[PDB]
Amino acid sequence: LLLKELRRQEELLGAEAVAELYGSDANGCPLNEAEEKLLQIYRKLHGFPAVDPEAAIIERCKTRAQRLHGKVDTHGMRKRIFLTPRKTESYEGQWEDGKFGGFGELLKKLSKYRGEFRNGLREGEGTLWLRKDVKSPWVRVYRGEWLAGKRDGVGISWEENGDVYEGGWSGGKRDGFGRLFFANGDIYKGEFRDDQHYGRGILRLTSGDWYDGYWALGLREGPGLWCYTQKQQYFVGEWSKGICKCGTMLDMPDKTTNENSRFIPRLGLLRCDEVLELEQLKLRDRRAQEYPEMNVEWRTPLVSAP
Amino acid sequence: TDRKAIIKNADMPEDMQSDAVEVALQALEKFNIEKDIAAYIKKEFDKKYQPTWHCIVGRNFGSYVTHETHSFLYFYFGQVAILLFKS
Numbered sequence: 358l359l360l361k362e363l364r365r366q367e368e369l370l371g372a373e374a375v376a377e378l379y380g381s382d383a384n385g386c387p388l389n390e391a392e393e394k395l396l397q398i399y400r401k402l403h404g405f406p407a408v409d410p411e412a413a414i415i416e417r418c419k420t421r422a423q424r425l426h427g428k429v430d431t432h433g434m435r436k437r438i439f440l441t442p443r444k445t446e447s448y449e450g451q452w453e454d455g456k457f458g459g460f461g462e463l464l465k466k467l468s469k470y471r472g473e474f475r476n477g478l479r480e481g482e483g484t485l486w487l488r489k490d491v492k493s494p495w496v497r498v499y500r501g502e503w504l505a506g507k508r509d510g511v512g513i514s515w516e517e518n519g520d521v522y523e524g525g526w527s528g529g530k531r532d533g534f535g536r537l538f539f540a541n542g543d544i545y546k547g548e549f550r551d552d553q554h555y556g557r558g559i560l561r562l563t564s565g566d567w568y569d570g571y572w573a574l575g576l577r578e579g580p581g582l583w584c585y586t587q588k589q590q591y592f593v594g595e596w597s598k599g600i601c602k603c604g605t606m607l608d609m610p611d612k613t614t615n616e617n618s619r620f621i622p623r624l625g626l627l628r629c630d631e632v633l634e635l636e637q638l639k640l641r642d643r644r645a646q647e648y649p650e651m652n653v654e655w656r657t658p659l660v661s662a663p
Numbered sequence: 664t665d666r667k668a669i670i671k672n673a674d675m676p677e678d679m680q681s682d683a684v685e686v687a688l689q690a691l692e693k694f695n696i697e698k699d700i701a702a703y704i705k706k707e708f709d710k711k712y713q714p715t716w717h718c719i720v721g722r723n724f725g726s727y728v729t730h731e732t733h734s735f736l737y738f739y740f741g742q743v744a745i746l747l748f749k750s
Contacts, residue, residue: 606738
């Protein structure tokens, strides 16, 4: 029976995905629900090491508001209560001073949430689910800290497009240190503000190429280093509005072969450093004019890490 | 240290400019006269990418050319300057 269960899940998710998932490791992105329960089945069969978040959450909440005599508001443990007489919304959880003040389950027409509460709004750790309509089943997107109904913390996201994100959150938007995993397989480690790459970041693609540079307004913007790993060639220059125009091109030190990429000849411009310098001064002037008061080095200077 | 290629004006996706510098090196290895280098580079880009591309190669010049987006590159390596645009 266990083998039947495991095999039907494996054919449900896909054999390629199952084999890939066996090759996964803890440094990877947090899995979605199907992979999670597939691995639970696989482990409970094999014994291929134990965690429970709900236990810790409930551990945290029991110290909160308690029974008080003659209080004229809810202020306590309750069963399900409908917020409207039309029966479209419902909640089941503790109360404080007539508002949501503890851990409770909330059901909307299209959303459902389980987490802690403080003064009527979301202040704690919680998980969020969504559904397209009343017929569609639940789809999970969120896991992270809450404050005043919006995401002020470090959390989990599984975007609708198929992306998955890790990083800080503030004002309900991506803000802080974060790691982004794209649907096509790209990996981006960077620093986010205003749901764009407004900071220092490191990017690496599926084909092996990898990036170090600064980012602004969602595009590549600053001084940085790029490496063409298969060709053993690396590029250093300045980016402005998604595309770089000034740079120096060099071969990696260990190149010894005439085959993968040809060698750069050994002559160049006179005093080239001055010319490049003049160019990024031009770019900086135009940048300041087009986007004044902007700062690419907002919490990590270049001098700290070459 | 002395071996260096520098890009000083660019509107070009980056893998394409890597391809461009590779094939420019091939052009230098095969030929010596500027005109044949230009012919080879233009025909090669017109083959891999759709027509029409243009190329001007030399040592002392000044130029004013318009181009459509993501189709411009200008850089130094070795002995000669390369200007490339699609139009």
